[PDB]
């Protein structure tokens, strides 16, 4: 018994149209814990071998502060999904999808540090790599401890060849090597992880949406066709206009490269992060507290502003 197979009979279809993403204009549930989340898998059958069993065991094994611990991936004949601990406050894509929120560069450094330190453990032991890394697949938590979602998944994955064009639509994350071939391994390469952080770091670095060029926007299909094609002048987004941020941009430049030869390792990555931290802090909980306090300040300003504005408008 792997104590990882929740039987559908007991768990309840608990749902509510609560603040799913609490941003001004998933299947969040619960089971004998706190808010649980489901990640359905269209398998219709799974003959998990002892390799698969060890996969699930390892999935549970890595109990870490920056990981969304899995509990049970039900194997119902008519249903299957991964019951992952839900965390409110939405995703990081949601984290900035509300232009109202006013995070300014310190939050950004802290988030980058959190994700780097998370990934470090993420690919040394108990899981080689996930390969689905993305900005919008690592959501914030109640106390802004970033986690990582839908990793591992030896067999639970949307493997079936389907919707190649929407495959373009979401595939912008992955490395050019991923599109270079016809079947990259589901477990991405360590180089894949590095470059995927590069893409996410683009996302966090510049407030704008995913991967926008200067005066240039070509749709997902065409842009993915180009990036797979490859150009001697390679395609990528400009770091930023901030005159004091060339080091984050250069880090990303080193991150995505034509060949994995000089793709820097996350060890050097965190080295540069500590260098650019300018000795901000040397405390563990103080950073959490500052994050929370300034978040509350932003919410205070938002509520005052909009409430007063529309009330007087009335």
Ligand X SMILES: Nc1ncnc2c1ncn2[C@@H]1O[C@H](COP(=O)(O)OP(=O)(O)OP(=O)(O)O)[C@@H](O)[C@H]1O
Tell how strand 70-74 and strand 29-30 pair up: unpaired
DSSP string, 120-172: HHHTTSS-S--S---GGGSB--TTS-----S---SS-S--S---HHHHHHHHT
- 268 binding partner (options a copy of itself, ligand X, none; Cβ < 5 to 8 Å by kind): none
- 300 binding partner (options ligand X, a copy of itself, none; Cβ < 5 to 8 Å by kind): a copy of itself
Q: Does 130 bind ligand X (CB under 6 A)?
A: no
Q: CA 258 → CA 27, 104, 188, 231, distances in Å?
A: 39, 32, 17, 10
Say if residues 172 and 224 touch (Cβ distance below 8 Å). yes
- 94 binding partner (options a copy of itself, ligand X, none; Cβ < 5 to 8 Å by kind): ligand X
- CB closer to ligand X, 26 vs 52: 26
165 burial (CB, 10 Å; 0-12 / 13-18 / 19+) is exposed
**How far is it, in rounded angstroms, from Cα 247 to Cα 158?**
37
Q: State the nearest-atom distance from the C-beta of 58 to ligand X, in Å.
A: 19
**How far is it, in rounded angstroms, from Cα 288 to Cα 268?**
25
- CB closer to a copy of itself, 111 vs 248: 111
Estimate the share of the chain in helix, then strand, then coil, as percent rounded to the nearest 5. Answer: 40, 5, 55
Which region among 81-89, 159-167, 260-268, 272-280 touches ligand X (by CB under 6 A)?
Answer: 81-89
Which region among 11-19, 47-55, 83-91, 300-308 touches ligand X (by CB under 6 A)?
Answer: 83-91
83 burial (CB, 10 Å; 0-12 / 13-18 / 19+) is buried
Q: Does 174 bind ligand X (CB under 6 A)?
A: no
Q: Does 135 bind ligand X (CB under 6 A)?
A: no
Residues that bind a copy of itself (CB under 8 A): 19, 22, 24-25, 88, 142-143, 285-286, 288-289, 292-293, 295-297, 299-304, 306-308, 310-311, 313-314
Positions in 25-44 near ligand X (CB under 6 A): 26, 37, 39
Q: Does 155 bind ligand X (CB under 6 A)?
A: no
Which residues lie below 8 Å from residue 292, measured CB to CB, with a gap of 6+? 143, 144
- 175 binding partner (options ligand X, a copy of itself, none; Cβ < 5 to 8 Å by kind): none
- 295 binding partner (options ligand X, a copy of itself, none; Cβ < 5 to 8 Å by kind): a copy of itself
Write out the residues near ligand X by the rule CB under 6 A.
26, 37, 39, 68, 84, 86-87, 91, 94, 132, 134, 136-137, 139, 149-150, 158, 170
């Amino acid at each position: 018994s792997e104590l990882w197979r929740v039987r559908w009979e007991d768990v309840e279809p608990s749902s509510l149209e609560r603040h799913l993403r609490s941003a001004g204009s998933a299947k969040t549930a619960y089971y004998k814990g706190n808010l649980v989340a489901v990640k359905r898998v269209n398998r219709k059958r799974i003959e998990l071998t002892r390799k698969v069993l060890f996969e699930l065991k390892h999935m549970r094994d890595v109990q870490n502060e920056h990981l969304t611990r899995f509990v049970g991936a039900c194997t119902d004949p008519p249903n299957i999904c991964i019951l992952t601990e839900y965390c409110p406050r939405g995703s990081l894509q949601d984290i900035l999808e509300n232009e109202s929120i006013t995070l300014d560069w310190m939050f950004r450094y802290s988030l980058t540090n959190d994700i780097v330190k998370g990934m470090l453990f993420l690919h040394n032991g108990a899981i080689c790599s996930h390969g689905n890394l993305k900005s919008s697949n690592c959501v914030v938590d109640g106390r802004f401890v970033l986690k990582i979602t839908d990793y591992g998944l030896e067999s639970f994955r949307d493997l079936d060849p389907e919707q190649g064009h929407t495959v373009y639509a979401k595939k912008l994350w992955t490395a050019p090597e991923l599109l270079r071939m016809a079947s990259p391994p589901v477990r991405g390469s360590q180089a894949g992880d590095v470059y995927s952080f590069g893409i996410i770091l683009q996302e966090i670095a510049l407030r704008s949406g995913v991967f926008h060029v200067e005066g240039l926007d070509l749709s997902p299909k065409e842009i993915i066709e180009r990036v797979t094609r490859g150009e001697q002048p390679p395609f990528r987004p400009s770091l930023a206009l901030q005159s004091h941020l060339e080091e984050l941009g250069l880090l990303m430049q080193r991150c995505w490269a034509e060949d994995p030869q000089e793709r820097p390792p996350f060890q050097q990555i965190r080295l540069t992060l500590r260098k650019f931290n300018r000795e901000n802090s040397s405390n563990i909980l103080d950073n959490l507290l500052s994050r929370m306090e300034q978040y509350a300040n932003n919410l205070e300003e938002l509520v005052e502003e909009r409430t007063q504005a529309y009330l007087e408008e009335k």
